Amino acid sequence: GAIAGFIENGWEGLIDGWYGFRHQNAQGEGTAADYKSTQSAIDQITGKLNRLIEKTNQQFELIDNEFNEVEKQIGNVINWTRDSITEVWSYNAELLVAMENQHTIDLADSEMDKLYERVKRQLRENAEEDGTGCFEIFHKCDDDCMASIRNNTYDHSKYREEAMQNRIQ
Amino acid sequence: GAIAGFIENGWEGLIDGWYGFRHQNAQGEGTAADYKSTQSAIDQITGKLNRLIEKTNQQFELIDNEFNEVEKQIGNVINWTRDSITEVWSYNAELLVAMENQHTIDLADSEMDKLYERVKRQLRENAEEDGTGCFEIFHKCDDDCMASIRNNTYDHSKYREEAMQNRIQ
Amino acid sequence: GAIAGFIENGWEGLIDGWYGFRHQNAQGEGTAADYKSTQSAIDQITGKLNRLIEKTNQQFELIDNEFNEVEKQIGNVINWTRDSITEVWSYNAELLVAMENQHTIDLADSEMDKLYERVKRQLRENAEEDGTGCFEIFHKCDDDCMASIRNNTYDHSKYREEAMQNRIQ
Amino acid sequence: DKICLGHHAVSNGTKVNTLTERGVEVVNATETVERTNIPRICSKGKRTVDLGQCGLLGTITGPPQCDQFLEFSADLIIERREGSDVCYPGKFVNEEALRQILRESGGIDKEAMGFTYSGIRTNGATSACRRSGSSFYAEMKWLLSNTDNAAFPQMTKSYKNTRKSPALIVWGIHHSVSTAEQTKLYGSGNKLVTVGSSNYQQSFVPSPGARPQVNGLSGRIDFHWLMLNPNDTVTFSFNGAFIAPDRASFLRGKSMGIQSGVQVDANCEGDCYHSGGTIISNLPFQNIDSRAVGKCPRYVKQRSLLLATGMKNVPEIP
Amino acid sequence: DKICLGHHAVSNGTKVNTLTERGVEVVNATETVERTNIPRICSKGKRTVDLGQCGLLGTITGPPQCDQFLEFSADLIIERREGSDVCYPGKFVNEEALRQILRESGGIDKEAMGFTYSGIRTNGATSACRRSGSSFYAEMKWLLSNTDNAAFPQMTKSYKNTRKSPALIVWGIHHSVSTAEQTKLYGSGNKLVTVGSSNYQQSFVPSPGARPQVNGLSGRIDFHWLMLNPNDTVTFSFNGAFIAPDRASFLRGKSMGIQSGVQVDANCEGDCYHSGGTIISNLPFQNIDSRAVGKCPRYVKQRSLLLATGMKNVPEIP
Amino acid sequence: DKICLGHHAVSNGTKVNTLTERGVEVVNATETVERTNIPRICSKGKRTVDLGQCGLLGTITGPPQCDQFLEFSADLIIERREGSDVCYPGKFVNEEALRQILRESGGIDKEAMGFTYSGIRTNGATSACRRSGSSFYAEMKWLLSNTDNAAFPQMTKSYKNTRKSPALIVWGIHHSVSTAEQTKLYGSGNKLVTVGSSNYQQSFVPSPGARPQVNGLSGRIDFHWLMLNPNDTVTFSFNGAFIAPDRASFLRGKSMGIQSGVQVDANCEGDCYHSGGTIISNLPFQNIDSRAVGKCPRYVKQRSLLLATGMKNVPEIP
């Protein structure tokens, strides 16, 4: 009955948030979502969406005719120009999406690290990293204690004696 | 009379550098700028500027006339081509700036982390993170000691006994 | 006879991989490459290459003549359009390469950090960072022990007593 | 006691592309390239004319098919393939330039040019332009000699644009099937028609000759046009084979013209059109038609470009 | 004892845009889109001609307004709206193509074509081209019959380009107000002018007819041109209604032509021009004029695009 | 005991560019801009014609140089500078549009138009089109009067395209050196040639006049062309100075035409061509020729753009 974090593992059970906490104590196992980190990621992603939704005010009209074909020379110049421009936008579209996706994925990983680093800094000297994205807490942490970590009210000074004693001895 | 670091806080008093140190000991509070990290950030930013200042050698001449309007058909082809190209550069400009700004901001945060990680590695086992971007030093650190940290000459072996004794006991 | 890691130092002797391990114990000094991290970097770089090798199916034909020059007005419109489009691709090419190179270099540094962070998490409380990209191991680590670290089979629980005793006393 | 940090994941992953990978699964993605087309012309909010059989250029000269469009007005103008500019066989010179002008004219206002004629006939009509009986272009006058083979007197009619906008002037040159027919209509001798403005000097001559019968006729009436600057004057000197105008045209304002083969819809509201319908989309790109007009997303070759709207999808270790 | 790591910040933040955010404050930013215009033509370093009333095409035919420009030389050529190519009413055929050629010619060198005439007059002059008294285009010869209604002899003059550069050849066709006036000038009968080269075969005919009076004249002289390849020859066969050239033109080298309505400045140094002045800028983009010419930043729709030159601005916790 | 993490490096570093730095050394880099050119025309897999002295338009009218190309077929068409469309001095009208059509025609199929003539000669020949002796365009017929100065009867020949593809129709107008020579060939009086279709009405007139001697001749035969829609008909009414066609042309399918000055190679396989050879490359860009055709990488101004294929190169501390 072991639990593991993000270092190689997603949580298909986490369904009310993007990032979250999963703990196990004497009271049992539990999973909660972190609001702040989840919303930050959603805000940045929707920020990209709004940015790509921005319509253009440039209006274009007909320059050739698909009923009565225009003269050959000017017609071929037109087709050559259109196809050239189509190549450009097709390239831009391909590149834009590819570039955005690389960043969307990276900033998502970044938020995960920030959350992990926040929790590490909270626990101070009362816990050790297990290398799977989890912290081994070297003191008794009931549900209320675990909840104190999620809402950033964990006072490490309270458990420092008990923890450092278990880490060393 | 508490001081805090970068984890949620800029310093409007830091006016001779981008990144810096703020300490408090028995001698009092102090603030100094870090040269190396500041210059690195400035070099990369100006590097972008020089890159966008690079002029073009392509010369363009008139193809229409704003005094005596050219023939309609070739005129509309011209306007259609120009407007199409204007759409492309307007897109490129918008994207370029947006992309650069995202990177400028990110590399600036990166330099901050690098500086913080450098200092953490200097102090070894003689200090603990408070979670605000500050290090709680578990030994006596006068102005000279603080200065030794800024110029990367802090020998942790000198204070290791005194520090680990205060961290544990 | 001191060794140093990546924090300011490449290894011209590492010739069978991109990333690797360099250790020194009683048995002497040694250097080995890490496969997983090296391949990951190579996969992403070749991923870019394949992405830029993707050919186009747009075929273009002649619209002017270099033997018998076309009429001036339509000729100048053509040259103006071509040169305009050439400016666009020249910009795109310049930007694409510059953008890719910045990312290629950054993701390479990222892999280095990930490897370093992995090893740090393996050693748990049995080692300390020296600030040069190396870990000072506070216990006896023969070649077999060093090999156990490279293939991620290092059990920190085995050396925890001996190590924490040397770190504190 | 242990607390673990994690991120969500699904078994319903969707593959996208990055700079490095191709087919990397993310939690959630959305489409950027529109392919969903509305096979109608969304005309809500815009005054719309479905010319149908009336060719756009026909609105100026006025064949029977365009009688209801002689002074039309619209925000959106729709050309149909079955449309025709002519009744009597012929074509416009600089036809496409003129079309592009009328597509954004907002319609046309017609004004009498006030030409009067002396020793000739003006009742030139034909079976090809039927209107109850044999007729002609509603805006034009087919001039003849008076009886048959009779001499056509030299003339010189002029018209001034007394309005603050340029006037669209159109006239025609008739090309008889034979010099025999040209003589029967306008009398013997070489006919000449010269058109003079203050920045226009073109000259014209009939080219009688045998041609394939279009609608039973081998004759050709081909139209020419110029824009008359405000306060400027046009002058028509001629001695036959001349299709004179009765009214000039003035552009109403602003509009947009399209070619289409699908029905009009007055309840849907669109702004980007193609021959196959309307593209209503907030997506930045589209893969429907490269020649789409109005305010449209950029056209691209690709049918699909997925934008990641979620993190990388990493399956839970079972 | 405690040491804190930090970064600077200001209360004077400026908002920029990123991929994710819109209006994120940074410490410092700079503009990338130029909007600052110099309402003059910076001509320092470049030899500049302000044609003024002289139309660019006028430098070849030579109305009175262009007498000081018959063999001009420049690096920068400036067209003015009040400019005119003609004295006697008329226009060039392929005018814009010819303009584009002369705008980068670096000026023109004129050479006598050496035509001599026998049984005619060459002193055709008019009130529209006044120069002290009635005159004509300085580079052309208005040919007549000899007395009035007299017969104009058929002729055939030729000229060879003995230079290593193409020669600009210009001639004119006169369109009289009436066949009466055409007869008065060149005698009766149908007039024909044919121009022959080794890759040019055009033919020409006068189109006498009544036209609006420009400067009191209803007559029209319209000019035509071709480029004569080195060592090649042009041949002019005609019997009246022909405006013969006296001199040919040779392009001096390289230049740039612009249209403008603002004064010239010889102390400022520029390289990008528009009708409203000069854009001097190291900025990559500009929002001043899309039709700007020379070496210019790219034109964009946006008036402003701020580039962050500082980190994100995070206010200090008070 | 100590373990160190590191990355490799070299003393053989190559400089590349990023957003921030210019000349940052990386371990390994590759080129993205192609500059390596193959000075041949790689024709393996494609049926190739090297027209040589035969001008592309010559394949339709048929001067002696193009006799082996009258019904050619190809996937790749190569024009050479020494190529010529004519034997008797002259040129095509809309020549370039016609070239662009034939470059992707896949070749031409010729069909007899079946014209027969009564009271005239059809054996018009010249020294300029030598074929054993004096001859003419293989696909055309030079029509004359019958004896000399004799009257040329008015005629009217027609041809219908009974095929599912458009027919390329070409005819010529002869411009004699003098009205004396025009009279000698086709008799006195003003000659007229009218060409009628169901969407084409052009008229033509000879322009006799003295011109420079090309290959010893001052006469000019200039060709005109139209595309004949399926089931449609063309009609030729004329009384002299008319170069009649004997056969019509039908496009075979699909091809690509290029202009080049380098040899053909049938063992190498290419798809992007320019006048100087073939660009075979997987690189996204090229700096060889902007006017390169086929399926090619994008052209750029830069000769080199290095893409980093390795990490940053940091030298080992010695």
Ligand SMILES: *[C@@H]1O[C@H](CO)[C@@H](O[C@@H]2O[C@H](CO)[C@@H](O[C@@H]3O[C@H](CO)[C@@H](O)[C@H](O)[C@@H]3O)[C@H](O)[C@H]2NC(C)=O)[C@H](O)[C@H]1NC(C)=O
């Ligand atoms: C997977 O990604 C898609 C795309 O981002 C998400 O669908 C989006 O859901 C939001 C809210 O449900 C939609 O917002 C809408 O805004 C319009 C404004 O015009 C409003 O009228 C709607 O009532 C709604 O509030 C958004 O349009 C929609 N996007 C698409 C393309 O359908 C989806 O939520 C993501 N999956 C999960 C599980 O979140």
Ligand SMILES: *[C@@H]1O[C@H](CO)[C@@H](O[C@@H]2O[C@H](CO)[C@@H](O[C@@H]3O[C@H](CO)[C@@H](O)[C@H](O)[C@@H]3O)[C@H](O)[C@H]2NC(C)=O)[C@H](O)[C@H]1NC(C)=O
């Ligand atoms: C806020 O950002 C702007 C833009 O980067 C900074 O202004 C820049 O200041 C530098 C030095 O003061 C200027 O460098 C100049 O280079 C030219 C080379 O032609 C030289 O002639 C000048 O004498 C000067 O050395 C640079 O032009 C200038 N940029 C702009 C757009 O004015 C500014 O310093 C930043 N704010 C702070 C507080 O640093």
Ligand SMILES: *[C@@H]1O[C@H](CO)[C@@H](O[C@@H]2O[C@H](CO)[C@@H](O[C@@H]3O[C@H](CO)[C@@H](O)[C@H](O)[C@@H]3O)[C@H](O)[C@H]2NC(C)=O)[C@H](O)[C@H]1NC(C)=O
């Ligand atoms: C420095 O970077 C270059 C470019 O990435 C590396 O050269 C590349 O080496 C690989 C394998 O040696 C080549 O792969 C090839 O693929 C083709 C597929 O058509 C196959 O036919 C070949 O047999 C080969 O497997 C790749 O083409 C080649 N790239 C170039 C531009 O030559 C090079 O390996 C890097 N340096 C080091 C030390 O790795």
Ligand SMILES: *[C@@H]1O[C@H](CO)[C@@H](O)[C@H](O)[C@H]1NC(C)=O
């Ligand atoms: C322009 O492209 C369209 C689409 O393939 C084609 O149908 C048309 O024929 C082209 N125009 C000319 C003049 O060939």
Ligand SMILES: *[C@@H]1O[C@H](CO)[C@@H](O)[C@H](O)[C@H]1NC(C)=O
């Ligand atoms: C080209 O665009 C300009 C700018 O709006 C406009 O004034 C001009 O009329 C356009 N050209 C034609 C031929 O309509």
Ligand SMILES: *[C@@H]1O[C@H](CO)[C@@H](O)[C@H](O)[C@H]1NC(C)=O
């Ligand atoms: C188009 O550009 C080429 C390359 O410089 C030049 O040789 C040609 O003259 C240009 N076309 C015209 C019509 O000037």
Ligand SMILES: *[C@@H]1O[C@H](CO)[C@@H](O)[C@H](O)[C@H]1NC(C)=O
């Ligand atoms: C208008 O045209 C008349 C000739 O019809 C001319 O005399 C007058 O100067 C022009 N301008 C005005 C403002 O009347």
Ligand SMILES: *[C@@H]1O[C@H](CO)[C@@H](O)[C@H](O)[C@H]1NC(C)=O
């Ligand atoms: C120049 O033109 C003459 C005819 O005027 C011709 O005989 C000669 O071959 C041409 N070329 C040279 C180099 O003289």
Ligand SMILES: *[C@@H]1O[C@H](CO)[C@@H](O)[C@H](O)[C@H]1NC(C)=O
């Ligand atoms: C073909 O042309 C003939 C006249 O030559 C015409 O009667 C017929 O309607 C046309 N169409 C078909 C399918 O025969």
